Structure 1
Amino acid sequence: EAGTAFIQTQQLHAAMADTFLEHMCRLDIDSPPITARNTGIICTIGPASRSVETLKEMIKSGMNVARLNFSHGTHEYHAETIKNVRTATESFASDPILYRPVAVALDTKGPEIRTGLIKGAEVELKKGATLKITLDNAYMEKCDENILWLDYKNICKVVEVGSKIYVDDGLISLQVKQKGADFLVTEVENGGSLGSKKGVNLPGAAVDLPAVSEKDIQDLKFGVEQDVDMVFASFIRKASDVHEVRKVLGEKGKNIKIISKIENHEGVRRFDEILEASDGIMVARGDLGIEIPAEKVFLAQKMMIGRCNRAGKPVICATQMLESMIKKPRPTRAEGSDVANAVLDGADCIMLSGETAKGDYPLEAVRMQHLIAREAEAAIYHLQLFEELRRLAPITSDPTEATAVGAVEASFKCCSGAIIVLTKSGRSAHQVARYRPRAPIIAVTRNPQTARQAHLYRGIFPVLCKDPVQEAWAEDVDLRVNFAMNVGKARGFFKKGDVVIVLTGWRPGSGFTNTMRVVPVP
């Protein structure tokens, strides 16, 4: 096999139900899944998971993307994580059929509001009471109940009367009564224990902090040097923030995908322009949950995933996934359901955080994610997804687009085992993925970066062809198609006598993946 996630046996000839309701009634928990796991698994690599050995096991169990969290660590430390990721990835390269591309993602620390120290270190903040938030440094090393300092100079500009301010990522709540001439005076809504350099969130305030801190500028230039596939850009509030990130990555980093993290109210409010400007979106439920009423976050998640699905842009669901698996070898029922529901809402990828970065069971976390994501696939109602996305786009006439919608249509009609797409940039495979076929998309490419970036898209299984370009265009095609047939047979996607859809250009160095073939598997 070469890993517990390698073989994902499909059955192609099930009756598709005429209604969503019937699709639900037919679910059967005693039935093994009969579909591939189509959602991407992103794991945060840190102290628990950064050894070459653990990483190999994680790749086997279904990790597609390694996330590096630049909130902590030096460049040296993260360069050594990346090197171990690439060693573990390349250890499977000897067998091109069993090689799984693994992407590297750099997640920036991003703009932050921090308190100043207690004196340096705890203080008890009293339900009711008053607290003055002060702003000049002559009060930074001394806090306690009376006063509190923080580094965001413009708080007073962006806060109004009755605004919430949260301290220590949600713990302490505050209610601003008056803006007191470059000061703030606050009623303690919640109250708890207060420490030093604790994070501050401003629900519904249009924070004025730069798109990119100087620390992020240096971390993004390191990402370019280190050849990363994508960046997760923090606290994105407007289209300009994205353009700034893109400016920093410049010409050398132009092929690096920018995933915008939506972590506050302004980001949700300005989502359309953020989406316009971005390559993808990450929904940070934890951070949204501080910034926005608890009970609206599920609305915000569903909206963002629907809009991304409509634009054909990758969306990653993040934070609070299998967080209990930091300390235990199984997740709760509720975690299972939350993960499942993100896949069912239409997420392309699910990201694991502390569960893989620093906890006691990184391996089991990956495996459990793969199990849940794969079981969720039974409850996806493919017909409706495809029918609605088809119905919700213009004429276009872009040959590659027209051919993508056709391949997906053909995949349903023929109950195909796969859609094989030959692609240099990945674009055709991405265009196929936005129409949400049931069949796996086998994206055959010679470009190693294309192959790694393809993991951002639901349903793309990237395979990296290492064979040189054959002279005769038609036999170069048959060779890449052959490689795909062999992977798909080996992963149990299909077998002899099944049918697959094949997408290609026509003749060498053509503009457009504009050629669709329906091909029996030999």
Structure 2
Amino acid sequence: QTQQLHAAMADTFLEHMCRLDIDSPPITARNTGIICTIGPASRSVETLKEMIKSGMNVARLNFSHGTHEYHAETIKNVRTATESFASDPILYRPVAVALDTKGPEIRTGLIKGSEVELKKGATLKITLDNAYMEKCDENILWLDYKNICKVVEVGSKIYVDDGLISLQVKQKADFLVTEVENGGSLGSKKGVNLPGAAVDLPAVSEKDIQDLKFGVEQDVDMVFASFIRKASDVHEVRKVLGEKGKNIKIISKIENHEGVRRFDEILEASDGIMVARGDLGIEIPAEKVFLAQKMMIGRCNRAGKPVICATQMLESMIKKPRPTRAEGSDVANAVLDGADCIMLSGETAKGDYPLEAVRMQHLIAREAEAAIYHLQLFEELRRLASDPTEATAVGAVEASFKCCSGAIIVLTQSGRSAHQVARYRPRAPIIAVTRNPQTARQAHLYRGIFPVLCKDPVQAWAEDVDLRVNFAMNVGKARGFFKKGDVVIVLTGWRPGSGFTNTMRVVPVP
């Protein structure tokens, strides 16, 4: 039988796992969103067309590097590739654009162009003298945190390049003499972490302000805000986006100890969360990252807010055409944890197999979605959760289970009722029909929402509803979600475009 349906009927979680079947094929519809960092390997229009075909739902632009002119061209190519499919509204896939801020990063300078291997036990002077900012080598290392001497002490550890090189402070005015603990090849402009230090860089720098206002002008759908430590950090990003930017979603990136400790107030202020595991796993012990990941996904699921699992998910795929077994496991387990979206960074921005990495997240996510123990998840989501709109949504999810429906079709202007359905994690895909292009793009933050953009003019109320529902039916049939004779759940508002989404039909597919 398909869909891991045999495992779905188990009465304990242990027997659920015992019943998982590699010969039970999944449905077609892949529910977990796939966010791809764009860069030199993926930014041509022709490659972006294949990215979209392969599964990309959100294009991430990392403003830690690059110029506004460069990112504007990348965004233009994303939209050219996306709109090349706009001819057929039945098959068109909305693609969202995300701006990922630099935030309070610390980076080294450029290595002398005349790369450097740091030898364990060797000495290294860190300098703040900008005279060396492009002459870094094995003896003098410039970095850009001007206040570093005030927050580090003798004994402190300084981590460089994804925490792979470690230094220990031995002498501390405008310099630090360090000893090399774990060495390696030092490159240019590498990230620096000071775990346990009270780094006093601003949450929103002058550059961040410029990048955020640029994002408003470029009509980005969401911001991934780096190094959020507290609710007031989020409010500062909110203020910069301002009223013109009021509909841009703010995803707070949790990647240091304070952001974990203050997670609840951050989540309350944010539209969603990134588990930003790269920095997180340097700021806190690497063996604790999985606790923070499962905490955050759980609390986001409890709150009904989007959560993204990010970073090194398919890392080896930067150089290889197939992932390691731990990478296959990591993607599957993030989906089983409850992540709304999964992300690729260097695998799509700069590696040799960007399309293969997207395709692999698609395949793994689909298999893992079938393996979800919906009986326990749905029961716990219901018990831990009312107004009429919530009741209609949970009623639609139960009806979809009762008839193993091919889809839950939701007519929505802002996405809210589609979000409410997604919160209970139905097995069936949620086809969200909207006339709002921004709603269609932003919907990808939510597990299981397949947004479709209706271009037809407003009809004649009852005919206009029937138009959009029949649109969703054509979408579902064309994409292989269901066929004539299947059953679908349809959700609508009381009238017009009401937020009082209170109407459910159970409809055979003609």
Common fold, TM-score beyond 0.5? yes
Taking a change above 3 Å as real, the CA distance of residues 479 and 156 of structure 1, as seen in their structure-2 partners, is same
The whole-number CA distance in structure 1 between the counterparts of 2:27 and 2:504 is 26
Q: Does the CA-based 8 Å contact 1:27-1:378 persist in structure 2?
A: no
Taking a change above 3 Å as real, the CA distance of residues 354 and 167 of structure 1, as seen in their structure-2 partners, is closer
SS at match of 2:281: helix
SS at match of 2:8: coil
Shift in Å, 1:288: 1.5
Q: Does the CA-based 8 Å contact 2:160-2:191 persist in structure 1?
A: yes
The whole-number CA distance in structure 2 between the counterparts of 1:9 and 1:226 is 43
Q: Does the CA-based 8 Å contact 2:57-2:95 persist in structure 1?
A: yes
Q: Does the CA-based 8 Å contact 2:4-2:370 persist in structure 1?
A: no
Map residues 229-268 of structure 1 onto 2, 5 A cutoff.
Answer: 229-268=221-260
Q: Does the CA-based 8 Å contact 1:263-1:288 persist in structure 2?
A: yes
Shift in Å, 1:9: 9.8
Q: Does the CA-based 8 Å contact 1:10-1:493 persist in structure 2?
A: no
Shift in Å, 1:191: 3.6
Shift in Å, 1:444: 0.6
SS at match of 1:14: helix
Shift in Å, 1:509: 3.9
Deviations 1:394-453 (A, max 9, x none): xxx332222222211222223222111110000111111111111111101100000000
Shift in Å, 1:519: 2.2
SS at match of 2:458: coil
2:314 maps to 322
Deviations 1:382-401 (A, max 9, x none): 121111111112xxx33222
Taking a change above 3 Å as real, the CA distance of residues 43 and 148 of structure 1, as seen in their structure-2 partners, is closer
1:3 maps to none
Shift in Å, 1:104: 1.0
Deviations 1:271-316 (A, max 9, x none): 1111111111111222212211121111111111111111111111
Shift in Å, 1:73: 2.2
Taking a change above 3 Å as real, the CA distance of residues 105 and 344 of structure 1, as seen in their structure-2 partners, is same
Taking a change above 3 Å as real, the CA distance of residues 198 and 330 of structure 1, as seen in their structure-2 partners, is closer
The whole-number CA distance in structure 1 between the counterparts of 2:313 and 2:134 is 37
Q: 2:492 aligns with which of 484, 500, 504?
A: 504
Q: Does the CA-based 8 Å contact 2:3-2:25 persist in structure 1?
A: no
Map residues 40-439 of structure 1 onto 2, 5 A cutoff.
Answer: 40-115=33-108, 125-128=118-121, 133=126, 149-159=142-152, 162-176=155-169, 186-194=178-186, 197-393=189-385, 397-439=386-428
SS at match of 1:317: strand
The whole-number CA distance in structure 2 between the counterparts of 1:253 and 1:459 is 26
Q: Does the CA-based 8 Å contact 1:124-1:192 persist in structure 2?
A: yes
Taking a change above 3 Å as real, the CA distance of residues 81 and 160 of structure 1, as seen in their structure-2 partners, is same
Q: Does the CA-based 8 Å contact 2:381-2:424 persist in structure 1?
A: yes
Mean alpha-carbon deviation: is it higher for 186-195 or for 266-275?
A: 186-195
The whole-number CA distance in structure 1 between the counterparts of 2:45 and 2:11 is 48
Shift in Å, 1:130: 6.2
The whole-number CA distance in structure 1 between the counterparts of 2:474 and 2:132 is 68
The whole-number CA distance in structure 2 between the counterparts of 1:140 and 1:89 is 40
Taking a change above 3 Å as real, the CA distance of residues 499 and 77 of structure 1, as seen in their structure-2 partners, is same
Q: Does the CA-based 8 Å contact 1:9-1:492 persist in structure 2?
A: no
Shift in Å, 1:127: 3.3
Q: Does the CA-based 8 Å contact 1:9-1:35 persist in structure 2?
A: no
SS at match of 1:508: coil
Q: Does the CA-based 8 Å contact 1:10-1:35 persist in structure 2?
A: no
Deviations 1:447-468 (A, max 9, x none): 0000000001001011111111
Q: Does the CA-based 8 Å contact 1:121-1:195 persist in structure 2?
A: no
The whole-number CA distance in structure 1 between the counterparts of 2:360 and 2:431 is 24
Shift in Å, 1:71: 2.1
The whole-number CA distance in structure 1 between the counterparts of 2:398 and 2:341 is 24
The whole-number CA distance in structure 1 between the counterparts of 2:319 and 2:401 is 43
Mean alpha-carbon deviation: is it higher for 81-90 or for 508-517?
A: 508-517
Q: Does the CA-based 8 Å contact 2:7-2:19 persist in structure 1?
A: no
Taking a change above 3 Å as real, the CA distance of residues 130 and 50 of structure 1, as seen in their structure-2 partners, is closer
The whole-number CA distance in structure 2 between the counterparts of 1:467 and 1:9 is 36
SS at match of 1:110: coil
Deviations 1:138-158 (A, max 9, x none): 886787777655432433454
Q: Does the CA-based 8 Å contact 2:301-2:423 persist in structure 1?
A: yes
SS at match of 2:471: helix
Q: Does the CA-based 8 Å contact 1:62-1:370 persist in structure 2?
A: yes
Mean alpha-carbon deviation: is it higher for 380-389 or for 495-504?
A: 495-504
Root-mean-square deviation (Å): 2.7
Does structure 1 residue 17 correspond to structure 2 residue 6? no
Q: Does the CA-based 8 Å contact 2:6-2:19 persist in structure 1?
A: no
The whole-number CA distance in structure 2 between the counterparts of 1:76 and 1:500 is 46
Shift in Å, 1:479: 1.2
Taking a change above 3 Å as real, the CA distance of residues 345 and 162 of structure 1, as seen in their structure-2 partners, is farther
The whole-number CA distance in structure 1 between the counterparts of 2:253 and 2:148 is 22
Taking a change above 3 Å as real, the CA distance of residues 185 and 57 of structure 1, as seen in their structure-2 partners, is closer
The whole-number CA distance in structure 2 between the counterparts of 1:12 and 1:516 is 25
Taking a change above 3 Å as real, the CA distance of residues 80 and 177 of structure 1, as seen in their structure-2 partners, is closer
Note the residue ranges of structure 2 that are not aligned, 5 or more in a row. Answer: none
Taking a change above 3 Å as real, the CA distance of residues 174 and 25 of structure 1, as seen in their structure-2 partners, is same
Shift in Å, 1:262: 1.6
The whole-number CA distance in structure 1 between the counterparts of 2:264 and 2:154 is 29
The whole-number CA distance in structure 1 between the counterparts of 2:46 and 2:137 is 47
Shift in Å, 1:369: 1.6
SS at match of 1:13: helix
Shift in Å, 1:336: 0.9
Q: Does the CA-based 8 Å contact 1:13-1:415 persist in structure 2?
A: no
Taking a change above 3 Å as real, the CA distance of residues 197 and 373 of structure 1, as seen in their structure-2 partners, is closer
Taking a change above 3 Å as real, the CA distance of residues 152 and 37 of structure 1, as seen in their structure-2 partners, is same
The whole-number CA distance in structure 2 between the counterparts of 1:11 and 1:198 is 44
Q: Does the CA-based 8 Å contact 1:10-1:492 persist in structure 2?
A: no
Shift in Å, 1:114: 3.0
Q: Does the CA-based 8 Å contact 2:4-2:26 persist in structure 1?
A: no
Q: 1:473 aligns with which of 453, 461, 485?
A: 461
Q: Does the CA-based 8 Å contact 1:115-1:197 persist in structure 2?
A: yes
Mean alpha-carbon deviation: is it higher for 441-450 or for 181-190?
A: 181-190
Shift in Å, 1:87: 1.5
Shift in Å, 1:219: 1.4
Taking a change above 3 Å as real, the CA distance of residues 53 and 126 of structure 1, as seen in their structure-2 partners, is closer
Q: Does the CA-based 8 Å contact 2:133-2:143 persist in structure 1?
A: yes
Q: Does the CA-based 8 Å contact 1:204-1:264 persist in structure 2?
A: no
Mean alpha-carbon deviation: is it higher for 76-85 or for 129-138?
A: 129-138
Shift in Å, 1:185: 5.9
Taking a change above 3 Å as real, the CA distance of residues 61 and 119 of structure 1, as seen in their structure-2 partners, is closer
The whole-number CA distance in structure 1 between the counterparts of 2:361 and 2:182 is 35
Taking a change above 3 Å as real, the CA distance of residues 319 and 153 of structure 1, as seen in their structure-2 partners, is same
Q: Does the CA-based 8 Å contact 1:347-1:458 persist in structure 2?
A: yes
Q: Percent of aligned positions with the same letter in both sequences?
A: 100
Taking a change above 3 Å as real, the CA distance of residues 392 and 109 of structure 1, as seen in their structure-2 partners, is same
Note the residue ranges of structure 1 that are not aligned, 5 or more in a row. Answer: 1-7
Deviations 1:174-193 (A, max 9, x none): 344676x7765655433445
Deviations 1:194-253 (A, max 9, x none): 456443201133322111222221111111111111111111111111111111111111
Mean alpha-carbon deviation: is it higher for 349-358 or for 457-466?
A: 349-358
The whole-number CA distance in structure 2 between the counterparts of 1:178 and 1:430 is 54
The whole-number CA distance in structure 2 between the counterparts of 1:54 and 1:371 is 20
The whole-number CA distance in structure 2 between the counterparts of 1:243 and 1:122 is 41
Shift in Å, 1:98: 0.7
